[PDB]
Design a protein around this ligand. Sequence first.
Ligand code: NAG
Ligand code: NAG
Lengths: 231, 221, 221
Amino acid sequence: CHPRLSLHRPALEDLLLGSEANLTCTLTGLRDASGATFTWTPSSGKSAVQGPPERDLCGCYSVSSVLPGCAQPWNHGETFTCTAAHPELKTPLTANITKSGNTFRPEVHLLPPPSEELALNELVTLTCLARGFSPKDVLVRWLQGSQELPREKYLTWASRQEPSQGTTTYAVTSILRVAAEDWKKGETFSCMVGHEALPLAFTQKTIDRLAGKPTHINVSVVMAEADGTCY
Amino acid sequence: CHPRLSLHRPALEDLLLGSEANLTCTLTGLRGATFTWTPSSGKSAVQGPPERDLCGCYSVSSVLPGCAQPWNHGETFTCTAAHPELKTPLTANITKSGNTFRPEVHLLPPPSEELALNELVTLTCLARGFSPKDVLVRWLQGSQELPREKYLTWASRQEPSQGTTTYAVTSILRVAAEDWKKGETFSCMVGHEALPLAFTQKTIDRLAGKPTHINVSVVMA
Amino acid sequence: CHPRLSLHRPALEDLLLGSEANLTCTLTGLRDASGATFTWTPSSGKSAVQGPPERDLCGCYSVSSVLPGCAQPWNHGETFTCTAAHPELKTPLTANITKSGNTFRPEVHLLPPPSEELALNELVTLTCLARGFSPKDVLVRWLQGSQELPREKYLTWASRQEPSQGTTTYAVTSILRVAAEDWKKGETFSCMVGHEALPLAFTQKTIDRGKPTHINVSVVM
Ligand SMILES: *[C@@H]1O[C@H](CO)[C@@H](O)[C@H](O)[C@H]1NC(C)=O
Ligand SMILES: *[C@@H]1O[C@H](CO)[C@@H](O)[C@H](O)[C@H]1NC(C)=O
C-alpha cells in the first residue's frame, strides 16, 4: 500500500574489521519503478546506485540506494540526510541518522565447563556472555590456541534487552563444543567481543583446565633475605 | 489477493500446565467460509470473530478445542476448508513428532570478577540437544516462583552438528548481592515434550564454587 | 450394619501426569437387583458408565458410577453432585464433593549417609523427607543422572498426619539403597515430590559428595 522511508546504520563488521562503510536508504511502496534520485547533504561522490527492486506480499516494488566512504564522518560525529522525489505522496519524504551517544561498554565473562560433562568424556561446552552495553550491535569470535576457528563451529544468539535497573542495556550469548581429550592435554580457548564503546574495539578472556574450577590451589611464596640492608 | 491455509500445533504452556489445548486452522483471503474436521470428536468449533494483516487480505481463523488426549495418543488431524474464491477445497494435516530427544540442563555459578563490586550476581541456565524446538523456562527463589518480568530468555536456535538436528536455548537471572551472601537458594526449571515427568530442575547457592583444598607455603629462606 | 454413600476424588497420578480424570460413586453390600439408578446432577453430555459387576464379601454386589472428562471443571472450582435410587433402597440419597482450599506447600529434604555404614562399604541409604502440606496426596519418584529408576528399587510409607500446633499438616518418607562403587565414583541421584499446591506441580532435590574445604599453610624457616 502506501510508501514509507527508512534509514539504516552502517554494518558493525565493516567499521571494525573493514575498509569501506556504506550507508543505505530504502523506500518501500513503489508501484513499478520511478524517477527517484536521492539527496544526501554531504555529497562528496554520491554514487547512489539503486539496482533491481525486490518483490513483496502479493507483488510490490521496493528500491534502495547506497553511499560509500563513511568512516571519519560517522566516527567524528557528522550527520546525514536522505530524501527522494516520487509520485505516490504529497511531499517528498525525509530521514536522518546520527551515531549514538550515552553508551556503555560490555562486561565479558567466560565460564568453565560444568562438572558433570567432564566425566562422560565425549565433548565439553564453553559459554561466553556479554552484558550491559547500550547500542545493540556486537561481534563474537572464538580462538583455539592462537588460531581463529571458522564460523560454523559455534552458535551465537541475538542481542536482546534485559530487565531494567536504571538505564536500558542489552546482552548476548554463545557456545562452543570441543573434544574432551584436548581439555586435558592443556590447550587454551579464548573469546573475543567487538563493540563500539570499547577502547581499541576488541577485548578477550581466556580459560583452560587449571584456571576455572580447579579443585586444587597450589601456591608457593618465597621471601629471600628479609633482614637484608634494604636500600 | 492470494489464498493460503495452515495448521498449528497446540501451545506448550497449555499442554503442560492447564490442559485446555486448542488447535488452529487459518485462512488468509476474502479480497462466508466453512471448515471441516475429519476426526469427529463431538464438540464442534467456533469461527473467528476476522481481523486483517499486512495492509491487505483480512484473514479468518477457526479453532477446534478439547483435543489434548488425542494429540498425545498419536492420532492424526486434518482440516478441510471451502471458499468462493477456491476452485477445490484446500486440505492440510498435522501429526505429533517422532524420534524425539530430551534436553540436558546446566546451571552455572557466577564469575568471581563479579562479586567484587557488591551490586548483583548473575546466574546462567543452558539447555542443549533436544529434537522438537519448543520449550519453557521458569525461575524460582526458594519456593516462590518469580514473575516473568524479572529475567531474560533467548529463542531456540539450531546447533551445528553433523549427526542429527538439535536445538539450544539460554537464560539469565540477576539477583541481589545481599541475598546471595545470606545463603538463599535459586532454581531453574525446563519443560519439554520429550521428558518423562515434563519438568527438570537444577539449583545453586553460595557454596559449590568454592574449591576443595588450598595449599599455601611461605619459605623464609 | 449398612453403608451410606459418599464421593471420592480423582487420582493424583492421572491428574498430574496429564492423562485424564474420573469420579467415582459407590454403594454396596447385598446381592440385589440391577436397578442401581446412578444419576449425575452436572453432566456435559457424556454421562457415566454403570461399571463392572464387582463382588465383595458374602456376595456384596458392587457396581459404581464413573464419568470421564473432569479436569477443567474440577480445577477451576465447580461443585459436583451424585444422587442414586435402588430397588431395595427406593429412598434416594445424595453426596457432594468440592476441591479443597487452605493449601500449604511442602518442604523436601534429602539427607546424606550414617557414618557407620560409610565405613562399611557395603550399601548406603538415602532418605527423602517431605513435611507440611495440606491434603494427604503426594507422589514420590527417584532418579539417577537423567534416567528414571523403576518403582521397585525403593519403598515409601503412607502419609501420616503430624501432631503440632493449630492446623493439620502431613508428612511422608522414602529410602533408596545403592551400591558403593558408583557412589564413591561420583554418580548422582534425585528425589522428586508431586503435590497440587506447587505452581509447577513438582520439585526435585539432588545430593552428591557437602564436605568442607581443607586449608594447609606451612612456614619453613
Ligand atoms: C531528525 O528527524 C526528525 C523527524 O524525522 C526530527 O524530529 C528531528 O528534529 C531531526 N533531527 C535533526 C538533527 O535534524
Ligand atoms: C498428510 O501428512 C502426510 C505426512 O504425514 C503428507 O505426506 C500428506 O501429503 C498429508 N495429506 C494428505 C494425506 O492429504
